[PDB]
Amino acid sequence: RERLNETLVSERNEVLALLSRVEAKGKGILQQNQIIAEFEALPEQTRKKLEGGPFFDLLKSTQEAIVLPPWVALAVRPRPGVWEYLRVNLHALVVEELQPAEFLHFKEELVDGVGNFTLELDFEPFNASIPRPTLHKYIGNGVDFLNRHLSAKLFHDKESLLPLLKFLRLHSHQGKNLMLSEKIQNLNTLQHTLRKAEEYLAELKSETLYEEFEAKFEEIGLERGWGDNAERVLDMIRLLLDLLEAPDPCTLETFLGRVPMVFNVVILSPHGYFAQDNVLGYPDTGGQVVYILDQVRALEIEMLQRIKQQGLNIKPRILILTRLLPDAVGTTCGERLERVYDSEYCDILRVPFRTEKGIVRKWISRFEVWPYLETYTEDAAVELSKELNGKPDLIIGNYSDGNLVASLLAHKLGVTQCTIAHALEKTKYPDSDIYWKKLDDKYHFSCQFTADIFAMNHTDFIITSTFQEIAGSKETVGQYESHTAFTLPGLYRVVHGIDVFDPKFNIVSPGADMSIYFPYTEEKRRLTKFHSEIEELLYSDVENKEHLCVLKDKKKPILFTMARLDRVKNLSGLVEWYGKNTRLRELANLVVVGGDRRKESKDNEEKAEMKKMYDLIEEYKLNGQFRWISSQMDRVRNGELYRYICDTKGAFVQPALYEAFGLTVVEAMTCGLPTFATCKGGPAEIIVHGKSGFHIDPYHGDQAADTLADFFTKCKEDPSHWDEISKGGLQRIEEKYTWQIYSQRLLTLTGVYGFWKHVSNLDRLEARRYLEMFYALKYRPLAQAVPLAQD
């Protein structure tokens, strides 16, 4: 409680520090972020501030300032993952620190005004099993932590080793036996068997194939899965002997990663139009889709090599479960089963939504799918049962509906589970927790937040794309972190939602497919076949549903952006910033890609957003400096489009109020296009300001706009400046975001957590019942509440 002291500085700086604590009261009955809490009386103050001493502590890091009756409460975040909540009152003295459940009480009085036995969700009791890291370093590093604990627990405890034995003893695929046979009933014989094997094997030649000694092995109790040749079987036998004797983290991870485990993979991505063509840019259809497609291709390749290396011929299968939309014309979304491009074993598997009145045909927004998901789970269980040979080895959920379903599916089928958020709506729609009720009929946030909290704790491990997605930065709160303590007044109060230190978080950074996106400077690789099309797309004088307005001057650098068109993407905002700044309009041309104007739009935000764009063109008279391009569905041509922007020596700008990750940011950089990205969410981590690109603030756009004008201004003066950043980006990407290590990491995690799952089954039993009841008595009602779509 140190941060409740630096504020006691009222005794020193009083006649000043009770001013900023006033000019906040002069806002009233609300809450505001650092942007507001800070940029209020602090900057708007007078040199009678001179508060740059001890007090800048709490202001500089205070997440939200919530104004109320005489009392104002602050939320102060000294370090990522550590929270102290405080309230003093305005003019008056006596500022006392608040408990978490209590600070929320104060937030709820800000809306409803006052339900005693109204529910509290607390997960902290339900996990104390393994301890948790207090160290920044282990956030998103959880597997490294679990390893070290697992290593310790395993070290010379007879009983403690038995789990590992049973694991390898039961383990099997499609009825075929792998690793250890039923002959090994205890550590004694396993110790002995392994030893005899190493004897025999150490003697034979390096390249000797398993088939040779399979005879002997089968005799002594060893089935396949140890390796393809003797050299590899030896290594694996040693690894195990070593975990029996003196376990260590590097070994445990290595051995567990190596055991053949993952053959059938199930991936949930229900909402949106999920396809390989004619989709991207549509509502709800975006980076999650791209990510899963690159993901399975990579995953397949790694799986194949692992299987081969371990002495198995098994055929892997990966299914992406999504929804069957029979009426989406010009897409493949109507076909049950579809092969993923450039894979032997990866298939999209489509299953329809239905009610007792039969299947539901029309596309439904991701916010409205809730009522449909439980039946989807049942039906998908059945379909994936048909296609799969054996059961799922790994289930990965995606986003809220995907995570909701994958939890149900994994409980049902008893399979290791992973979740990937891809975004968390609560950070994208500010104060949508406190203000949820008035948003519900439109966004139904009550169901989503529930599905999120549900899946988050239900899953075995969680993958994130950045550190920021978990704990954010030193200044700002993380995406998951913001779920630790929050309330939805009138519904329930989440006292501990999730813990930024939970050993289950793992950061595995995706990448962009390198055959699609490469440096604009490799001429041999450029796709020139596309230049006619692109010349038309950017520079033609025809205005239509494909593109709006016109570029008068074809030689200017292009300021480029591409995205789904919804309010958070903020494309309209950028269009405004550009509109108002005359120096920038002078230097560059604006080209925005988003929304599909070929068809009438069924999405609320999209529709709204098209209205603003239409207006803004008229307001700022954008014709001749602006080109508004409709959704571009082909990634291949997209790669060449990015590179083309490079030829003009332009930039990529991503002006989102919040961006959970931002693949377009990764894409642009990969092509060598200097990128200005929003500082809210993932791109804050992706880009190193000044080195691999620049940050801008969607909340100060007029500044964003003039920053861009500075950049272009510098490059005209010193063209090497453009090249400097281009290279910075190219490097950042090579260093951080690439698909190669991804799959290896993912498979290894599945191995570790899979075994962990079996040791720790006994203490998660309570949390399982807790979560069962939450879903049953909280989710199901909220979902049934949601209006059905009408065909």
Ligand X SMILES: OC[C@H]1O[C@](O)(CO)[C@@H](O)[C@@H]1O
Ligand Y SMILES: O=c1ccn([C@@H]2O[C@H](COP(=O)(O)OP(=O)(O)O)[C@@H](O)[C@H]2O)c(=O)[nH]1
Residues that bind ligand X (CB under 6 A): 272, 284-289, 366, 399, 422-423
Rounded to a whole number of angstroms, the minimum distance from the CB of residue 188 to K ion is 17
Rounded to a whole number of angstroms, the minimum distance from the CB of residue 133 to its own copies is 6
563 binds, among its own copies, ligand Y, ligand X, none (CB under 5 to 8 A by kind): ligand Y
> Taking a C-beta distance cutoff of 8 angstroms, is the pair 67, 33 a contact?
no
369 binds, among ligand X, ligand Y, K ion, none (CB under 5 to 8 A by kind): none
> Taking a C-beta distance cutoff of 8 angstroms, is the pair 319, 396 a contact?
no
Which among 766, 175, 176, 80 has a CA at the least distance from the CA of 470?
A: 80
Rounded to a whole number of angstroms, the minimum distance from the CB of residue 261 to ligand Y is 29
Rounded to a whole number of angstroms, the minimum distance from the CB of residue 36 to ligand X is 25
180 binds, among ligand Y, ligand X, K ion, none (CB under 5 to 8 A by kind): K ion
**Count, residues in the chain:** 791
661 binds, among K ion, ligand X, ligand Y, none (CB under 5 to 8 A by kind): ligand Y
Q: How far is CA 670 from the centre of its chain?
A: 20
Pairing of strands 547-548, 264-268: unpaired
Rounded to a whole number of angstroms, the minimum distance from the CB of residue 64 to ligand X is 23
What is the rounded distance in angstroms from the CA atom of residue 256 to the CA atom of residue 743? Answer: 15
Which among 581, 560, 588 has a CA at the least distance from the CA of 702?
A: 581
Q: Which of 95, 180, 405, 494 binds K ion (CB under 5 A)?
A: 180
359 is an interface residue for its own copies by CB under 8 A: no
Q: Give whichever of 472 and 594 is closer to ligand Y, judged by the CB atom.
A: 594
> Taking a C-beta distance cutoff of 8 angstroms, is the pair 99, 75 a contact?
no
Both structure tokens of 60: 């500089």
Question: Which amino acid, residue 84?
Answer: E
Half-sphere exposure (CA, 13 Å, Cβ side) for 628?
26
Q: Give whichever of 281 and 650 is closer to ligand Y, judged by the CB atom.
A: 281
Question: Which amino acid, residue 639?
Answer: G
Which among 460, 486, 504, 506 has a CA at the least distance from the CA of 754?
A: 460
172 binds, among K ion, ligand X, its own copies, none (CB under 5 to 8 A by kind): K ion
Rounded to a whole number of angstroms, the minimum distance from the CB of residue 252 to K ion is 19
Q: Give whichever of 76 and 262 is closer to K ion, judged by the CB atom.
A: 262
Q: Give whichever of 71 and 737 is closer to ligand Y, judged by the CB atom.
A: 737
* 3 state DSSP class of 395: strand
146 binds, among ligand Y, ligand X, K ion, none (CB under 5 to 8 A by kind): none
**x/- site string to K ion, residues 121 to 160, per CB under 5 A?**
----------------------------------------
Q: Give whichever of 136 and 637 is closer to its own copies, judged by the CB atom.
A: 136
- Name residues contacting its own copies, limited to 437-496 (CB under 8 A): 492
765 binds, among its own copies, ligand X, ligand Y, none (CB under 5 to 8 A by kind): its own copies
Longest CA–CA span in the chain (Å) reads: 88
> Taking a C-beta distance cutoff of 8 angstroms, is the pair 66, 53 a contact?
no
Rounded to a whole number of angstroms, the minimum distance from the CB of residue 659 to ligand Y is 7
DSSP state of 178: B
* 3 state DSSP class of 479: coil
171 binds, among K ion, its own copies, ligand X, none (CB under 5 to 8 A by kind): K ion
- Name residues contacting its own copies, limited to 406-425 (CB under 8 A): 408, 412
Rounded to a whole number of angstroms, the minimum distance from the CB of residue 208 to K ion is 23
Rounded to a whole number of angstroms, the minimum distance from the CB of residue 348 to ligand X is 15
User: 3-state secondary structure string, 737-759?
Assistant: CCCHHHHHHHHHHHHHHHHHHHH
Rounded to a whole number of angstroms, the minimum distance from the CB of residue 167 to ligand X is 34
Q: Which residue is at the shortest CB distance from ligand X? A: 286
202 is an interface residue for its own copies by CB under 8 A: no
Rounded to a whole number of angstroms, the minimum distance from the CB of residue 613 to ligand Y is 14
Phi–psi pair at 695, nearest 5 degrees? -105, 145
Rounded to a whole number of angstroms, the minimum distance from the CB of residue 179 to K ion is 5
Q: Give whichever of 285 and 476 is closer to ligand X, judged by the CB atom.
A: 285
Q: Which of 10, 177, 343, 540 binds K ion (CB under 5 A)?
A: 177
| Number of neighbours of residue 48 by Cβ within 10 angstroms | 9
What are the C-alpha distances in Å from 373 to residues 158, 328, 399, 403, 415? Answer: 44, 20, 13, 11, 19
From the number of C-beta atoms within 10 Å of its C-beta (0-12, 13-18, 19+), residue 650 rates as buried
What is the rounded distance in angstroms from the CA atom of residue 33 to the CA atom of residue 450? Answer: 24
From the number of C-beta atoms within 10 Å of its C-beta (0-12, 13-18, 19+), residue 147 rates as buried
285 binds, among its own copies, ligand X, K ion, none (CB under 5 to 8 A by kind): ligand X
Which among 446, 478, 389 has a CA at the least distance from the CA of 119?
A: 446
What are the C-alpha distances in Å from 325 to residues 362, 380, 402, 409, 512? Answer: 7, 15, 16, 21, 28
389 binds, among ligand Y, K ion, its own copies, none (CB under 5 to 8 A by kind): none
284 binds, among ligand X, ligand Y, its own copies, none (CB under 5 to 8 A by kind): ligand X
Half-sphere exposure (CA, 13 Å, Cβ side) for 723?
5
Which among 654, 732, 651 has a CA at the least distance from the CA of 688?
A: 732
Q: How many residues bind K ion (CB under 5 A)?
A: 7
What is the rounded distance in angstroms from the CA atom of residue 384 to the CA atom of residue 154? Answer: 36
Rounded to a whole number of angstroms, the minimum distance from the CB of residue 636 to ligand Y is 10
- Name residues contacting its own copies, limited to 137-166 (CB under 8 A): 137-138, 144-145, 148-149, 151-152, 155-156
* 3 state DSSP class of 562: strand
Q: Which of 169, 422, 564, 635 binds K ion (CB under 5 A)?
A: 169
Q: How far is CA 71 from the centre of its chain?
A: 37
192 binds, among ligand X, its own copies, K ion, none (CB under 5 to 8 A by kind): none
Q: Give whichever of 62 and 285 is closer to ligand X, judged by the CB atom.
A: 285
Interacting residue ranges for ligand Y, rule: CB under 6 A: 280-281, 286-288, 290, 562-564, 593-594, 631-632, 635, 638, 661-664, 667
> Taking a C-beta distance cutoff of 8 angstroms, is the pair 405, 392 a contact?
no
Q: Which of 552, 769, 785, 791 binds its own copies (CB under 8 A)?
A: 769
Q: Which helix (H) or strand (E) holds 306?
A: helix 287-309
Binding site for its own copies (CB under 8 A): 116-122, 125-126, 131, 133-135, 137-138, 144-145, 148-149, 151-152, 155-156, 191, 241-242, 245-250, 374, 378, 408, 412, 492, 765-770, 772-778, 780-781
Binding site for K ion (CB under 5 A): 169, 171-172, 177-180
